[PDB]
Scaffold this motif. Sequence first.
Motif, PDB file in Angstrom:
ATOM      1  N   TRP A  96       0.853  -1.253   0.000  1.00 54.82           N
ATOM      2  CA  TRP A  96       0.000   0.000   0.000  1.00 54.82           C
ATOM      3  C   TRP A  96       0.852   1.251   0.000  1.00 54.82           C
ATOM      4  CZ3 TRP A  96       0.347  -3.633   3.907  1.00 54.82           C
ATOM      5  CH2 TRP A  96       0.958  -3.179   5.077  1.00 54.82           C
ATOM      6  N   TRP A 140       0.637  -8.030  11.936  1.00 55.17           N
ATOM      7  CA  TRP A 140      -0.302  -7.767  13.013  1.00 55.17           C
ATOM      8  C   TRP A 140      -1.796  -7.864  12.564  1.00 55.17           C
ATOM      9  CZ3 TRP A 140      -0.006  -6.674  18.119  1.00 55.17           C
ATOM     10  CH2 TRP A 140      -1.119  -6.004  18.734  1.00 55.17           C
ATOM     11  N   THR A 141      -2.078  -7.229  11.406  1.00 52.61           N
ATOM     12  CA  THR A 141      -3.423  -7.105  10.913  1.00 52.61           C
ATOM     13  C   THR A 141      -3.999  -8.446  10.395  1.00 52.61           C
ATOM     14  OG1 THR A 141      -2.826  -4.839  10.428  1.00 52.61           O
ATOM     15  CG2 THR A 141      -4.713  -5.718   9.300  1.00 52.61           C
ATOM     16  N   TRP A 154      -0.509   3.415  22.363  1.00 52.56           N
ATOM     17  CA  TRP A 154      -1.698   2.680  22.789  1.00 52.56           C
ATOM     18  C   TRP A 154      -1.977   2.909  24.236  1.00 52.56           C
ATOM     19  CZ3 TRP A 154       2.451   0.123  20.245  1.00 52.56           C
ATOM     20  CH2 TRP A 154       3.448  -0.382  21.100  1.00 52.56           C
ATOM     21  N   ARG A 173       7.389   6.206  17.716  1.00 53.89           N
ATOM     22  CA  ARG A 173       6.088   6.241  18.390  1.00 53.89           C
ATOM     23  C   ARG A 173       6.054   7.394  19.371  1.00 53.89           C
ATOM     24  NH1 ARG A 173       2.697   2.155  17.242  1.00 53.89           N
ATOM     25  NH2 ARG A 173       3.764   0.456  16.011  1.00 53.89           N
TER      26      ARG A 173
END
Length: 574
Positions: free
Chosen positions: A147, A254-255, A376, A442
């Motif tokens: 992507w 992960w997805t 998160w 992050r």
Amino acid sequence: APTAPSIDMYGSNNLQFSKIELAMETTSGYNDMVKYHELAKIKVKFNQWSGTSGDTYNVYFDGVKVATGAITGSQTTASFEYGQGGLYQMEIEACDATGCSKSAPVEITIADTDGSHLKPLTMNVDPNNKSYNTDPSIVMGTYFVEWGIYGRDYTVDNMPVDNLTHILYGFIPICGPNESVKSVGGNSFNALQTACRGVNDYEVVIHDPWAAYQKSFPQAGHEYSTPIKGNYAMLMALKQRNPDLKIIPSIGGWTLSDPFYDFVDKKNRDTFVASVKKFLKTWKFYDGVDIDWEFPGGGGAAADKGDPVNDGPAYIALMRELRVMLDELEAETGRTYELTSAIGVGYDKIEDVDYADAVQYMDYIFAMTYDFYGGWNNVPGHQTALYCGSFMRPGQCDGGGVDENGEPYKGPAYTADNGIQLLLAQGVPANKLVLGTAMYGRGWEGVTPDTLTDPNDPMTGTATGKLKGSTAQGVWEDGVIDYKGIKSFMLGANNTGINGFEYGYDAQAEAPWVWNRSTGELITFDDHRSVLAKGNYAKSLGLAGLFSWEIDADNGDILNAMHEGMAGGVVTPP
Ligand SMILES: Cc1cc(N)c2ccccc2[n+]1CCCCCCCCCC[n+]1c(C)cc(N)c2ccccc21
């Protein structure tokens, strides 16, 4: 002699033949869109209007005879099968007792998914990627995401291929349960439903056939009628340029890991293993398979999945089974295929697989030494550190201590060395371990100076939320920023801080940060220093080398530091 054949170019599909049929201008199920043939069907029409036509024809490629058949009067169609892709100078000759006459030579193209018909890819690499003479035994890997050709505008010809040994292509899905894909939003889950229409559950598919093989890239010389386009045609042309490059499909992530949890049943492993064999016979530029099951035992995207008892033995059987299948392909093709896996390195992830058993089947383990801390939650820490930071409490590093509430730590803290030592201690060979570097940060906001328990260290503060930003800043989702974004918006060219950020480094952890004390924006990432430290650590322990997630987010600085930190080093390949 007979009249010389005159080739009807338009009657012969202008001499473009392909061993792979790929549906264009539509999106449907994988088995409807992708059809592979071990031999191309070559059909060439020719005519002989004047004179005698003769009895038999011969077809030559680069002067060597490749086919023969009967002449049928004034118009004949030569039909034959051919296995080897490439560009050839073709001549058709007609023969009888009086002699033979031959057509003028014309170029025929036989496309195959090894890229044998393609010229080396023309590259367009950011010149900040420098040249090195790293020894070829050392792994220098990265992930290129399917992507990344959209908003990220990063295409196959942008990769600094001379500086890479292994490109992992993220990511090939498995048909089946895949609720976790809905967390990406957009069309991703629906595109997978379409790809899996008419496909058995637990078989692999291409998630985005537009990006994989339909999109015409003008830099690759693609035309709308070219039979293979997309990222995959560019990867084939890249393999013509750099034939020792290993390009490996990464299955899961992960997805896309939800189907792996059903591999406790061997029937679903058999279906999957056979589908991967099929995939590697269809897409010949691929050199093995990488399995990114996140994670045996759970703790991934699917909160309702994971079996600490049964998933490890499933994973090990999967590797055993894949290696049997890859040995078949090596017998069949004469090639060498690699089997690898990216794995979690928290103690609670490593404890759920007996790697001493699995690794006998595998060439490399890509240890995911990143994502240890993140947006998160609101707890700052170093997301990709080698060692425990200053911010950690007594006993936090090894897990013997208690937290601020008096509760026992459950295991050693998340650092790269705590994970790599757990793997070494059970007998995983250092030379099969590849250490991960992050080409992203992050981050948090709200970490203002008043929140720090140690004023010198922002990793002792508390956040109020995720880092926010725009995609031009490399913030494609809150809490995550591309390294090239941190360089343009926080570090500056001299690496001393712009836009209100200051740079810091935890020398005990080997981990950098930038912090804007006004906004409380704090970003944990990897930089030239901490990647040099990772290279040095890899040389010190005899690891196989380094890899990174994800290449589109680097400006060259992180891959350059991966090479720089490995200078002089060699390793024994597995
Ligand atoms: C964008 C994009 C676009 C696509 N078309 C696409 C297509 C297929 C697959 C992914 C795709 N992706 C997404 C690719 C996502 C890559 C990175 C995923 C790892 C995320 C960090 C994982 N994580 C960790 C480790 C620990 C946590 N406590 C935690 C808590 C909450 C949330 C996540 C957490």
